[PDB]
Amino acid sequence: KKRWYVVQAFSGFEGRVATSLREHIKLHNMEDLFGEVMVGYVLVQMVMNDASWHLVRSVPRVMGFIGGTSDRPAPISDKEVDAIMNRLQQVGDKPRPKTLFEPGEMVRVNDGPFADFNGVVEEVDYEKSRLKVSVSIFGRATPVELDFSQVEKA
Amino acid sequence: VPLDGGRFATSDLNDLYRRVINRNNRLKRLLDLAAPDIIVRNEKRMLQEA
Amino acid sequence: RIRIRLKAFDHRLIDQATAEIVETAKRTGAQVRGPIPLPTRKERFTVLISPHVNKDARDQYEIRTHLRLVDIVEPTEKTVDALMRLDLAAGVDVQISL
DNA sequence: CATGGGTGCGCCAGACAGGG
DNA sequence: CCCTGTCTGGCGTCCTCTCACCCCATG
Prior knowledge:
This is part of a larger assembly, with chains A, B and C.
Chain A: E1 3-9, H1 14-27, E2 34-38, E3 41-46, H2 50-58, E4 62-65, H3 79-88, H4 90-93, E5 106-109, E6 117-125, E7 130-136, E8 141-146, E9 151-153
Antiparallel strand pairs in A: 1-3, 1-4, 2-3, 5-6, 5-9, 6-7, 7-8
Chain B: H1 12-33, H2 37-49
Chain C: E1 3-8, H1 11-14, H2 17-28, E2 36-37, E3 44-48, E4 58-62, E5 66-69, H3 79-82, E6 93-97
Antiparallel strand pairs in C: 1-5, 1-6, 2-5, 3-4
The structure holds a DNA duplex.
PDB class: ribosome
Keywords: ribosome, RNA polymerase, translation, transcription, coupling, transcription-translation coupling, expressome
Entry title: E.coli transcription translation coupling complex in TTC-B state 4 (subclass 1) containing mRNA with 24-mer spacer, NusG, NusA, fMet-tRNA(iMet), Phe-tRNA(Phe), and viomycin
């Protein structure tokens, strides 16, 4: 059974640390003592012998493990939470809000000179794919037609 | 203030404050993300030392 | 295809408003079909003035109305840009139908 | 382009262990 | 607990006049 551990690298050379770590594994052929390497912190599926500990700290541009002590360094705590966040990440970020504003509903403009402005859709045109919303420019409402993607639903 | 050439010769306190603010932003983001215990212990320890 | 309708009452204040928006568009976009007006609009109302009698005192007042349409020819990303939150005419209703 | 981590001084003095 | 050895800190003259040089590095 291989448990997880946290490695600190020089932040910025992290992919090169991961590649050099895989290569040191396949050099010193302790292939049965390493499972994966996940990407300033590098996650390593590993077991704990002092030989494998010296192996990971002899990988270049690696400071050391992060744990309770340096004798017996520490596996993890909320590893499941980290895995869940990694699975989402881009998926969670993706939103793409389009103007679903109907009669009276407020919308947001992010394209053309009217970008960075909000307003309400007094009239909507699904057939012409156009929303009739006015922007409060210099006080007076500026009824302009914007596409669903041109504006966001507020 | 810059020197003759134009590159800004920056003071040391700006390095210190900029380090503390970089680390504090990292620590707020990790407490947002619910990182595990050893990550936020190293993060708060680096803030303490900063 | 882009319409700039302007809606107010008098032609003696909108007359500087049709000058400010064709020339400031000329410096930035220089793409306009020229101001094409609309028929002047009249709202006349006869009203009784004596406080409790006498259905003869009817004085004619009117809230007059005027409309002028600018109609820039091309959707310019410079005319709208410079003239977005900008309108010289005060107490006016601008309708920048894009 | 922007960020990210040596080995030659000597005395005083008081606090911290370390016997005693 | 009463003395003894160690371990770290705190400190060491004042004015001036030039010079030289101030973060890589890189996918």
